[PDB]
Amino acid sequence: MTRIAIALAQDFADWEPALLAAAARSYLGVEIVHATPDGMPVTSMGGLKVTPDTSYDALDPVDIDALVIPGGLSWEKGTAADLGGLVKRFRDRDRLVAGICAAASALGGTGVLNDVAHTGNALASHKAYPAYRGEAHYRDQPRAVSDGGVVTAAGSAPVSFAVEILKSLGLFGPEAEAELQIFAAEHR
Amino acid sequence: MTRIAIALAQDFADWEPALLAAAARSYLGVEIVHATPDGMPVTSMGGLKVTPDTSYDALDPVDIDALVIPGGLSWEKGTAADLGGLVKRFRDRDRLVAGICAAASALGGTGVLNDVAHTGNALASHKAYPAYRGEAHYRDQPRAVSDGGVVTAAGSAPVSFAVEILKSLGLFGPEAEAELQIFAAEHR
């Protein structure tokens, strides 16, 4: 069985982790662990008051298969959490790490994007971080990218972000594909 | 001041009210009131433990411009809230009522779809409710429908659901369109 940690924060982007968590948990039998930087409740961009299971510091990769980090306003408000140690903790156990929107650029700041293909909201967004050394690997494309156990996406790409995470986890069978392929039709 | 009530429930579909709430509240200056049937917490399909602001019976249309009902599993689980009184309260005040996915068929069960153009997950989903007498007006199309102060959509159409709610409220300006137009690109 698969366990995914979703690292929430104040002003998290409601639409970014939603389809992944709802489909994984309710359709695919995945356990979802929600965490916040200090283990206390946070309020999403859309005003949802959410109580997490745990804090970032308590997350243990020993039995969590993936770390998924949604974007949101904390970065631009100057209150973003320190993800460096948390990302390294998961990488050290060769777990999937996924970041979307502002959190993709925060991943760049950890160094984890230095050596793998990736994307984000914009290359300039990643380059704002001095530790980001991954510029040659950035791919300016609309859909999520998955490479080397790291999945990244722009905040405009929540569906492919979900698909790539599930694919990477070996969970993208017919049920998963049936539930996630339905979102394109309203854009035709 | 525009205020939108979002009527959550146990096992609500995380991806359905997310874009609307986040964009409205964070970008467009809209106040979001989240409610559950008994006013106490509920758990989304994705496992979010959400503490709402209030209960359904405290929602007063004198003060609230729109009632937005996400779908989710309560209907299929046979534990859904009775929406008839709440919907009538809002409709009688000529407030927008919007329902997506299973909640669109639940709105059909109140009779509110009898006289307006609408859509849903499928015509047969609406027909499962004996009070639904709107078959002549059902639109089998991928995008949300807005007519007569009622907005409906399939669960696969969260973006157009949000856009039609915002248009109904006279809030779909250049800022709204810019935040909401970005989701098509990942589908080609």
In angstroms, the separation between the Cα of residue A125 and the nearest Cα of chain B is 17
Specify the DSSP class assigned to residue A50: E
Structure token pair of residue B112: 């509110």
Q: In what order do the strands lie in the sheet with B96-100?
A: B54-55, B31-36, B3-7, B66-69, B96-100, B150-153, B145-147
Q: Which residue of B has its CA nearest to A183?
A: B156
Residue A88: strand pairing partners: none
What is the spatial distance between Cα B14 and Cα A102, in angstroms, rounded to a whole number?
Answer: 20
Do A144 and B186 make contact, defined as CB atoms within 8 angstroms? yes
Selection from B153, B145, B165, B120 nearest residue B22 by Cα: B165
CATH topology of domain B2-188: Rossmann fold (3.40.50)
Do A25 and B13 make contact, defined as CB atoms within 8 angstroms? no
The experimental technique used to determine this model is X-ray
Selection from B188, B184, B170 nearest residue B19 by Cα: B184
Do B25 and A19 make contact, defined as CB atoms within 8 angstroms? no
Burial track A123-137 (b if 16+ CB lie within 10 A, e otherwise): bebbeebeebebeeb
Q: B173 Cβ partners below 8 Å, 6+ apart?
A: none
| Chain B positions in Cβ-Cβ contact with residue A20 (cut-off 8 Å) | 46
CB B154, CB B119: distance < 8 Å: yes
| Chain A positions in Cβ-Cβ contact with residue B45 (cut-off 8 Å) | 21-22, 25-26
Half-sphere exposure of A56 (CA within 13 A, CB side): 18
Residue A49: strand pairing partners: A43, B51
What is the spatial distance between Cα B74 and Cα A101, in angstroms, rounded to a whole number?
Answer: 31
A124 residue type, one letter: A
Residue A185: left if φ>0, alpha if ψ -120 to 50, beta else—which one? alpha
Handedness of CA B145, B151, B155, B157 (dihedral sign): positive
Structure token pair of residue A44: 């999403």
Find the Cα–Cα–Cα–Cα dihedral A154, A159, A161, A162, rounded to 10°.
150
What is the spatial distance between Cα B166 and Cα B161, in angstroms, rounded to a whole number?
Answer: 9
Q: Chain A, 126-185: which have a CB under 8 Å from a chain B CB? A: 142-144, 155-160, 182-185
| Chain B positions in Cβ-Cβ contact with residue A14 (cut-off 8 Å) | 14, 17-19, 21-22
Residue A89: CB atoms within 10 A of its CB come to: 16
Which of A14, A24, A143 lies nearest to residue B18, judging by beta carbons?
A14
CB A7, CB A150: distance < 8 Å: no
Residue B74 near chain A (CB below 8 Å): no
What is the spatial distance between Cα B184 and Cα B40, in angstroms, rounded to a whole number?
Answer: 36
Q: Which residue of B has its CA nearest to A153?
A: B186
What is the spatial distance between Cα A173 and Cα A11, in angstroms, rounded to a whole number?
Answer: 33
Do B183 and A187 make contact, defined as CB atoms within 8 angstroms? yes
Which of A26, A49, A73 lies nearest to residue B50, judging by beta carbons?
A49
What is the spatial distance between Cα A166 and Cα A137, in angstroms, rounded to a whole number?
Answer: 22
Structure token pair of residue B86: 């709440």
- Write the CA distances from B88 to A110, A157, B94, B120, integer angstroms: 53, 37, 10, 20
Residue B139: strand pairing partners: none
Handedness of CA A38, A16, B67, B172 (dihedral sign): positive
Q: In what order do the strands lie in the sheet with A42-43?
A: A42-43, A49-51, B49-51, B42-43
Structure token pair of residue B35: 């409610």
Residue B73 near chain A (CB below 8 Å): yes
What is the spatial distance between Cα A167 and Cα A173, in angstroms, rounded to a whole number?
Answer: 8
What is the spatial distance between Cα A146 and Cα A133, in angstroms, rounded to a whole number?
Answer: 18
Q: Is B58 exposed, middle or buried (0-12, 13-18, 19+ CB in 10 A)?
A: exposed
Residue A7 near chain B (CB below 8 Å): no
What is the spatial distance between Cα B176 and Cα B147, in angstroms, rounded to a whole number?
Answer: 20
Query: For this experimental structure, what is the resolution in angstroms?
Result: 1.7
